[PDB]
Amino acid sequence: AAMATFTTEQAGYQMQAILQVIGYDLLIVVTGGTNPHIGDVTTLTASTVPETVKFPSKDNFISERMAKRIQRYLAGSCTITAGIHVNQITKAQIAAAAPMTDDLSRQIISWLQAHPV
Amino acid sequence: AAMATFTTEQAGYQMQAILQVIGYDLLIVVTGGTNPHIGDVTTLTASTVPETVKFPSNFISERMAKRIQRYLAGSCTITAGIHVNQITKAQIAAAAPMTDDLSRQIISWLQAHPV
Ligand SMILES: [Mn+2]
């Protein structure tokens, strides 16, 4: 109804998006790999450029990529947290972050289309 | 071979996509109606997030880019500008299916003529 979980796994590790709808607004928690955390927070609306806070620890490539993918479908505000970490991550797994972020975005968008906010 | 033209017509007005291949890259020009123009431009590769520019007084170039993004071997630049004088609501509603129709046409051609 107002909450949903999306997963994807490529190159041998999983990333996950937990979506929460509050009124007309979105909260999306993106984690993955061995040690999930909150490394970056991206805020936006459909009309505004996304801003990112980076906490002390490039997780924002994920939170901002997702934001750009879904910006056109936002009925209100959107907050996206990202914290993916893979131990001894490989170049392949690093390359898989963008396709995986796109995959979660497409599930999210398709969810929003089935569940108009 | 390096250029192709696709058309569609629904609700009594036509849209056309002219495709040009330059190296591995694509230029696609979408026009339609009585007054073709360039009102929005979408750029993308298979692996970047498409970016749309809107010129002042944008769904078509953006919508086509998302349709075809996975089939791209290089860069893609899609211009779009359709205009119908006294456009009707059903003609508005027809722009999306016509965009999809051109997209399926374009995907078919790309697979038959692998860049
Ligand atoms: Mn981090």
Numbering used by the authors:
A (entry chain A): -1 to 55, 62 to 121
B (entry chain B): -1 to 55, 64 to 121
What's in the article?
Previous studies indicated that the small protein LpdD (lp_0272) is associated with the UbiD-type gallate decarboxylase LpdC (lp_2945) in Lactobacillus plantarum. The crystal structure of the purified LpdD reveals a dimeric protein with structural similarity to the eukaryotic heterodimeric proteasome assembly chaperone Pba3/4. Solution studies demonstrate that LpdD protein specifically binds to reduced prFMN species only. The addition of the LpdD–prFMNH2 complex supports reconstitution and activation of the purified E. coli apo-UbiD in vitro, leading to modest 3,4-dihydroxybenzoic acid decarboxylation. These observations suggest that LpdD acts as a prFMNH2-binding chaperone, enabling apo-UbiD activation through enhanced prFMNH2 incorporation and subsequent oxidative maturation.
Given both H35 and H61 are strictly conserved, we made LpdD H35A and H61A variants to test for the effect of an intact metal-binding site on prFMNH2 binding. The H61A variant crystallized in the same space group and conditions as the WT LpdD, and superposed with the Mn2+-bound WT LpdD monomer (0.24 Å rmsd). The loop region spanning residues 55 to 62 was disordered for both monomers in the AU. Residual electron density was present located next to H35 and D63 that was assigned to a weakly bound Mn2+. When tested using whole-cell decarboxylation assays, both variants displayed reduced activity when compared with WT LpdD whole-cell assays, with H35A more affected than H61A. In vitro reconstitution of the purified H61A variant reveals this mutation does not abolish prFMNH2 binding, whereas the purified H35A variant did not bind prFMNH2 under the conditions used. This suggests that His35—and by extension metal binding—is more important for LpdD function in vivo compared with H61, although neither are essential under the conditions tested. While mutagenesis of either H35 or H61 affects metal binding and, in the case of H35, prFMNH2 binding in vitro, both variants retain residual activity when assayed in E. coli whole-cell context.
